[PDB]
Ligand binder design. Structure first.
Ligand code: SUE
Ligand code: ZN
Length: 191
């Protein structure tokens, strides 16, 4: 298997949630084999890719987190070569690396607000209501197909801080009315 490769980012930039592709497929190939990636990186939310899967990853207090069902145990390519996972937990569906060169990191949420916001791979910011340890309800139902490819992306509080990592969708006949995520407290405990 190859290294995970950053192929873009989801910009909250200044005002607009928009997606920025920074690498093509072809280049994704050679880079996964070497794990050496000089391509420029920015921001908190990365679009990450394997040979078969595209999903997201989020930097929180110096660690780049994503889902195990996306990354597995792979390294992630960097300018100084392939980066080995700092944290792994198959049961939680969680993996972490040292935040990449060029990135910014999110702050853990400390305000306890139930008003959350899920960022998707499509660069949509979707309102969510905290409804338990690892669960939050959507204000608007959406088909799964819409959310697919967004695991590893962040759930944010109204202050912009990180509340969790998107893990799975709670679906009924293919309609998602809630989301399952890894809470930051769970990250802090994994560390
Ligand atoms: C947008 C949709 C959603 C965020 C996404 N997550 C999934 O699709 C997960 C993967 C797998 C099935 N998923 C689901 O969401 C299902 C599904 C019916 C398919 C919607 N929903 C579901 O279980 O409801 C259950 C009540 C909750 C409680 C149980 C959830 C279990 C969570 C889970 N843990 C592990 C630990 C270790 C593993 O080793 C290989 C593998 C795992 N796989 C898991 O779920 C996503 O976008 N992925 S992705 O980006 O396209 C892909 C590129 C990476
Ligand atoms: Zn907060």
């Amino acid at each position: 298997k190859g290294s995970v490769v950053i192929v873009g980012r989801i910009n909250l930039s200044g005002d607009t949630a928009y997606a920025q592709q920074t690498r093509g497929e072809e280049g994704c190939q050679e880079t996964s084999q070497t794990g050496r990636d000089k391509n420029q990186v920015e921001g908190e939310v990365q679009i990450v890719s394997t040979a078969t899967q595209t999903f997201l990853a989020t930097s929180i207090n110096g660690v780049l987190w994503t889902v195990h069902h996306g990354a597995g145990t792979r390294t992630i390519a960097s300018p100084k070569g392939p980066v080995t996972q700092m944290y792994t937990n198959v049961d939680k569906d969680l993996v972490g690396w040292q935040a990449p060169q060029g990135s910014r990191s999110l702050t853990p949420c400390t305000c306890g607000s139930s008003d959350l916001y899920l960022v998707t791979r499509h660069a949509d910011v979707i309102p969510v209501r905290r409804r338990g340890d690892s669960r939050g309800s959507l204000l608007s139902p959406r088909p799964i197909s819409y959310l697919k490819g967004s695991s590893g992306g962040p759930l944010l509080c109204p202050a912009g801080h990180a509340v969790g990592i998107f893990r799975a969708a709670v679906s009924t006949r293919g309609v998602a009315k809630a989301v399952d995520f890894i809470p930051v407290e769970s990250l802090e405990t994994t560390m």
